Amino acid sequence: ELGDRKGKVHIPFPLANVTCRVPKARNPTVTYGKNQVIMLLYPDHPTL
Amino acid sequence: EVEGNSQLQISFSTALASAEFRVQVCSTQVHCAAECHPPKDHIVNYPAS
Q1: How far B46 CA sits from the closest chain A CA (Å)?
Q2: Rounded Cα–Cα distance for residues A23 and A43 (Å)
Q3: Ramachandran class of A35: left when φ > 0, alpha when ψ lies in -120 to 50, beta otherwise
Q4: Which residues form the signal peptide (chain A) (predicted)?
Q5: What are the residues facing B21 on neighbouring strands?
């Protein structure tokens, strides 16, 4: 019962880029043998 | 420093363990040899000599 006679207003809460601190886990045990590096890391989270 | 009839301990590495490496003191040459022992650990961080 109307055409396109509508309105437009402001919309709050604008986005922005910040810097979030994330953790890094301790380095594991290293064994440097002949062509081999035994890294016994035990991650406290899912760690790629 | 060449100050007199003295010695400098030149610290340079090589690759082959028995090595007759040549060093020149600025007008002098020399080819001195050494018997190198191989290293202990496999894993290093940086490159070689």
Answers
A1: 14
A2: 11
A3: left
A4: none
A5: B32
